[PDB]
Design a protein around this ligand. Structure first.
Ligand SMILES: Nc1cc(Oc2ccc(NC(=O)NC(=O)Cc3ccc(F)cc3)cc2F)ccn1
Length: 295
């Protein structure tokens, strides 16, 4: 009971060559997983004719609450329509029955988010495993940069991990909000709320740190918004105990004060693939006692 067809002429006719028939996809509402706020992600299974099956993630939101921030839901998940990279979260399809709230469907990521996975104490990552995860994000990021796509919120909490341990870059979902992830933000974005690919590089450097500390919160002591004063003092995150020297050097390049002096994602894949190849997988990374329980 909503005059939908009023979204966009040759702009939102996308849900078409992207939609799928419920005649091949079920929904399991009881068992959940996603509920950080909006998009009450569930579970589900799609079908590929007579045999091929598949597990999934289904996130949705409100309804009769007008369409203002409701069209930005369909238009967000559609952003993935042309995101075909092993290291980037993909769009399975789109289906909205003649009475079912705005439904978004994604492939299931068994190991959840990169940050929770690495913080898990029953897991025993090696320096190599972690450098490998960073290399995969760099690869997906290189794809996105190639599309002139600006992420704006690159963080380990926003990367997914599947059953083969393939990292998928994503976004679990304004230039002055408190929700602004200022601790991943480059100096120039904190000052002028402008985001670029060079500002995702700075953020990538912080993600490498989260990786080498196994999900430690950055700048714990400065639990604020006023990180700009702290940074302009001549400060940077410190080298984690298990982070190789050549890798911390890459991090400091990512945090170059001059955005254009920062390496490109293509240079990062290159530099990190080299550092990664030198490891055999005999170095275990342990959790820092002073970061334990720190949020
Ligand atoms: N266990 C499990 C939980 C899951 O939760 C979710 C996790 C993430 C999303 N993200 C989303 O809706 N879209 C994108 O991220 C769009 C996008 C893609 C690439 C970019 F670079 C920027 C934005 C939705 C979820 F449901 C999914 C699968 N398995």
């Amino acid at each position: 009971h909503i005059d939908l067809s009023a979204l966009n002429p040759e702009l939102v006719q996308a849900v078409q060559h992207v939609v799928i028939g419920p005649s091949s996809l079920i929904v399991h509402f009881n068992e959940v997983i996603g509920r950080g706020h909006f998009g009450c992600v569930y579970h589900g299974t799609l079908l590929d004719n007579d045999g091929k099956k598949i597990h999934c993630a289904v996130k949705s939101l409100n309804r009769i609450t007008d369409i203002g921030e409701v069209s930005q839901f369909l238009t967000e998940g559609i952003i993935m329509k042309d995101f075909s990279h092993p290291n980037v979260l993909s769009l399975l399809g789109i289906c909205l029955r003649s009475e079912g709230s705005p439904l978004v469907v994604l492939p299931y990521m068994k190991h959840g988010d990169l940050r929770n996975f690495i913080r898990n104490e029953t897991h025993n990552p090696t320096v190599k495993d972690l450098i490998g995860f960073g290399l995969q994000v760099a690869k997906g990021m290189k794809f996105l940069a190639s599309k002139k796509f600006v992420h704006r919120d690159l963080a380990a909490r926003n990367c997914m991990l599947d059953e083969k341990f393939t990292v998928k870059v994503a976004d679990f979902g304004n230039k002055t909000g408190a929700k602004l992830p200022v601790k991943w933000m480059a100096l120039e974005s904190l000052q002028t709320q402008k985001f670029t690919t060079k500002s995702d590089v700075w953020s990538f450097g912080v993600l490498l740190w989260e990786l080498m500390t196994r999900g430690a919160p950055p700048y714990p002591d400065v639990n604020t918004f006023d990180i700009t004063v702290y940074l302009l003092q001549g400060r940077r995150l410190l080298q984690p105990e298990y982070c190789p020297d050549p890798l911390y050097e890459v991090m400091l390049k990512c945090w170059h004060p001059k955005a254009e002096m920062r390496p490109s994602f293509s240079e990062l894949v290159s530099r990190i693939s080299a550092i990664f190849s030198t490891f055999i997988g005999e170095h275990y990374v342990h959790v820092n006692a002073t970061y334990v329980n720190v949020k």
